[PDB]
Structures are given as C-alpha cells and as structure tokens.
Amino acid sequence: MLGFLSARQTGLEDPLRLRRAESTRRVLGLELNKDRDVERIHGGGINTLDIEPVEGRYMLSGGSDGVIVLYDLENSSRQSYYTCKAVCSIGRDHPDVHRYSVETVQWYPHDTGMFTSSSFDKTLKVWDTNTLQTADVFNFEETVYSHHMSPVSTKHCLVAVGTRGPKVQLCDLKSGSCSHILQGHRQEILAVSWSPRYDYILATASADSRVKLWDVRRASGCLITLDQHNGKKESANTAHNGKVNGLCFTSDGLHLLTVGTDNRMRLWNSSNGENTLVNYGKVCNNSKKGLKFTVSCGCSSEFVFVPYGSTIAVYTVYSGEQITMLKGHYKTVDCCVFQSNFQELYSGSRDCNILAWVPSLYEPVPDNPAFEDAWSS
Amino acid sequence: RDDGDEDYYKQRLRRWNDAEFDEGFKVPGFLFKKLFKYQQTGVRWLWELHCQQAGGILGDEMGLGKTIQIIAFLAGLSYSKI
C-alpha cells in the first residue's frame, strides 16, 4: 500500500499501476452494506438494475410487480450508513405504468434525460426522466425478455429487443422503424447485447442453444454462429447445451461472455467466434428468463459477477478462478450491476431488496462492544 | 453479337487491343467525366451500399440513364480490385 504510494511520487511505477492495484483490492474486499442501505419500494422481486453511463449517480430498478424506481447512490448526509433514497417512482397510480412485470431497464447512453423499460406486457417504453412520462411506446406480438441499446454508437439510436418469438426486433429511437427484423433463430430470444467496440455488431442468445453475432447493416444473415467444440464450419453449431439466457461483453469488447441453463459459462472471441476454453467450473443457472450479469472494469485483472442461485459468484475473466461467493440474499438473484468508479456492486433478487456490496478493510479507529464470545467459565 | 463465343470474344479483344472514397475505392477517370452530377451521386450511393453489404433500388424515372450508373459502379469496382 505504502510502497505503491512511494513508487508513485518517485516515478518508478506509472500512476495507473496503483489505481489498478487498489481497484482490484477493493473488489476482493467486497462485503455487504457496511455503510449503505437501499430504500425498499419494490413490493415484488426486483428484476433489473442499471447505473447511469455518466457520473454513475442514479440507478434504475424494475420489480416483478411492474413499478420502476429510480434511486440515488451517494451520501448527501454528513453521517455514514446513509440510505439510498429514491428520487422518483413510477407506481400503480401512474397512467402509463407497466401493468405486468418489467424485465429489464436501461439508461440511454450519452445523457441521463431518457431511459427505456421493457416488460412482460409486450411493450418497450421510452421515458422522460425529468417529467417521468413516456414519449414512445413500442408494442410487440409476444412477450419481451430483454432489450439493449448500443453504449458506443453515435450514428444511430437502434434498440435491439428480443421477444418470445424466434426473430429479433430492431427498433430505432430515431423515427419509429419497429420493422427491421433479424431472422436465423428458432426459439425465444432470451438475451441481446450490442458490442462496446463495434457500433453495428449485435449478439443474440436464444433458446435454440445458439448465439449469433449480427451486423445490423449486413443484409445477409448472421456473421458467426458460435459453437462449443470449435469444429470445421445453420441448424447446427450449438453455442451451449440448453438455454442460453445470458450475455455480457467484456470491458474492451474483445471477448464475449455467455451463461446458459447447462450450468456452464463460456468466454468467446468477439472477432472469429472461437471459444477460448476457459472452464469456470459449474455456474448454477436454472433461470428460464433473461439472466443479467456484469463484468468489472478498470482493475488489474477483469472480474465477472454472475448470479449463482441465492449468491453472486466472482471469477477472473481470463484465469477462470472462483474468487469468492457473496452470500447475502435469501431468494434467487437475477441482476447484478457494477459501479465502475467506486468498485461497488448492487444485486437485485426475488426477496424484494437491492443489496449493496461495498469494499471493506476501512474501519474507524477507536480511542467492538458487541464482538465478544459469551461462553461460561 | 455477345461474347458467348470464345473465338468471337478474343476477336473483339484484339479489336480493342480517378476519384477515391473513404473506404478506398477508385473509378476510371476517363469514364467519370462522361456522366452528369446525379450519376456521380448514384455511384457513390451504390458504393455506400457496398460498405454496408446491402442491396438497393434505383428508382430514377426513365430518361435519366439507369445502365450507366450501374456500369460506372461496376467498371469502377473492377478497376479498383477491392
């Protein structure tokens, strides 16, 4: 610690070294709400979370009852153990409320004045953050399992939505569109995620055990249908061995992470599509819906936090070793988000509470009355 | 007659015997001067469809010249050897 500081002011080590080292140390020291608490307004289980792309201050949340609650995640008070209050909530009284369970929500990249929520009521809604009303409503024939917006594209505002139908739907915020549709899948599309490196590259995961790398501009099918055993190469080339219900690109976009109900997790090269043969052990996954997970950014070695039953598992992205299990929840956890600036984690589960995982090893120095054994003598 | 006959084609050959775009694409200069301004736009628009690997409908109502814009893009593609 001190050696990292001294090596910084002296100039032996580049200043990024201490930051990456201290960042990865915070992730390893993650523990429950030592100085935090999330205000509970979700009557049902919480399905999704998203931190704003800029300034990472307000966090959306979508419950199983349809209410969507926008949160505040910094200590406006002097005292510690602050409670993460909710600036606003779109509840039952709202005229434009999701009648049924809202599956995933997302902040629009490049500004915080608009956010999109998609529910099981077969609709994707565009919202105005300031006025808390809608601007565009996109109805769909089948239920909606996921939707993603490109976090890096500046030439378009396409939102990719995967429905229970076997064919991807590409809606454009600019104009209405809602007609561009990608064919090549066979069953329910449980996860869609754009590539942070390439603007027009999209990954779609569906129940036919196939993940396809698409190019939206491309007018002829898919580019790569990822296979498991890297044979010579569709109605074949199964990406997993069951139902692929997860998708998370790495920080730089060079590799793809997928989770299926085969209790297996795989890391895939983004360009060619060959799997990198990182085994990850057994990753428990019985979810029949979209499973949301995240990957750490700005650390020495990237981490991946994937829901694991009633716990969250932390793995090294490339090494594939199990770091620790964050046993905090009582029901199954379905969404986890990562606060890049502060190396904190927020977990939404089905016990109707968002848990905050904050780095430990910083404690007040006294001059603990509860920390003693009471054994008789 | 068409070039279906090899002998005929060879006979014709014996008888017979530069703007750049963003991605890198050059057209024969001796042909670009023979078209009009709108035909240049169609050639650029057609090559714009080449970058995205998507098709297109060229709906210029008759008399504007449909063959030339296809040929100029086709000839330019052969010249550039992309």
Curated annotation (Swiss-Prot), chain A:
The keyword Protein transport does not apply. It is found in: Nucleus; Chromosome; Nucleus matrix. Keywords: Chromosome, Cockayne syndrome, Deafness, Disease variant, DNA damage, DNA repair, Dwarfism, Nucleus, Phosphoprotein, Repeat, Ubl conjugation pathway, WD repeat. Gene3D superfamilies: YVTN repeat-like/Quinoprotein amine dehydrogenase. Pathway: Protein modification; protein ubiquitination. It comes from the Eukaryota. InterPro entries: G-protein_beta_WD-40_rep, Rad28/ERCC8/Ckn1/ATCSA-1, WD40/YVTN_repeat-like_dom_sf, WD40_repeat_CS, WD40_repeat_dom_sf, WD40_rpt. Pfam families: WD40. WD repeats lie at residues 33-73, 88-129, 133-173, 177-216, 234-270, 277-317, 321-359. The modification Phosphoserine is found at S376, S377. GO terms for biological process: DNA damage response; double-strand break repair via classical nonhomologous end joining; positive regulation of DNA repair; proteasome-mediated ubiquitin-dependent protein catabolic process; protein autoubiquitination; protein polyubiquitination; regulation of transcription-coupled nucleotide-excision repair; response to auditory stimulus. GO terms for cellular component: Cul4-RING E3 ubiquitin ligase complex; Cul4A-RING E3 ubiquitin ligase complex; nuclear matrix; nucleoplasm; nucleotide-excision repair complex; nucleus; perikaryon; protein-containing complex. Its main location: nucleus. GO terms for molecular function: ubiquitin-like ligase-substrate adaptor activity. Part of the CSA complex (also named DCX(ERCC8) complex), a DCX E3 ubiquitin-protein ligase complex containing ERCC8, RBX1, DDB1 and CUL4A; the CSA complex interacts with RNA polymerase II; upon UV irradiation it interacts with the COP9 signalosome and preferentially with the hyperphosphorylated form of RNA polymerase II. Interacts with ERCC6/CSB (via CIM motif); promoting recruitment to lesion-stalled RNA polymerase II (Pol II). Interacts with KIAA1530/UVSSA. Interacts with a subunit of RNA polymerase II TFIIH. Substrate-recognition component of the CSA complex, a DCX (DDB1-CUL4-X-box) E3 ubiquitin-protein ligase complex, involved in transcription-coupled nucleotide excision repair (TC-NER), a process during which RNA polymerase II-blocking lesions are rapidly removed from the transcribed strand of active genes. Following recruitment to lesion-stalled RNA polymerase II (Pol II), the CSA complex mediates ubiquitination of Pol II subunit POLR2A/RPB1 at 'Lys-1268', a critical TC-NER checkpoint, governing RNA Pol II stability and initiating DNA damage excision by TFIIH recruitment. This is DNA excision repair protein ERCC-8. It comes from Homo sapiens (Human). The gene is ERCC8.
UniProtKB/Swiss-Prot annotation, chain B:
Phosphorylation at these two sites promotes the intramolecular interaction of the N-terminal domain with the helicase ATP-binding domain, thereby probably releasing the inhibitory effect of the N-terminal domain on its ATPase activity. Phosphorylation is essential for its chromatin remodeling activity. It is found in: Nucleus; Chromosome. It comes from the Eukaryota. ATP binds at D60, E61, M62, G63, L64, G65, K66, T67. The CSA-interacting motif (CIM) mediates interaction and recruitment of ERCC8/CSA. Homodimer. Binds DNA. Interacts with ERCC8. Interacts with RNA polymerase II; interaction is enhanced by UV irradiation. Component of the B-WICH complex, at least composed of SMARCA5/SNF2H, BAZ1B/WSTF, SF3B1, DEK, MYO1C, ERCC6, MYBBP1A and DDX21. Interacts with KIAA1530/UVSSA. Interacts with ELOA and CUL5; the interaction is induced by DNA damaging agents or by inhibitors of RNA polymerase II elongation. Interacts (via WHD region) with RIF1. Interacts with SMARCC2/BAF170, SMARCB1/BAF47 and the neuron-specific chromatin remodeling complex (nBAF complex). It is linked to Cockayne syndrome B: A rare disorder characterized by cutaneous sensitivity to sunlight, abnormal and slow growth, cachectic dwarfism, progeroid appearance, progressive pigmentary retinopathy and sensorineural deafness. There is delayed neural development and severe progressive neurologic degeneration resulting in intellectual disability. Essential factor involved in transcription-coupled nucleotide excision repair (TC-NER), a process during which RNA polymerase II-blocking lesions are rapidly removed from the transcribed strand of active genes. Plays a central role in the initiation of the TC-NER process: specifically recognizes and binds RNA polymerase II stalled at a lesion, and mediates recruitment of ERCC8/CSA, initiating DNA damage excision by TFIIH recruitment. Belongs to the SNF2/RAD54 helicase family. This is DNA excision repair protein ERCC-6. The chain holds residues 453 to 554 of 1493 of the full protein.
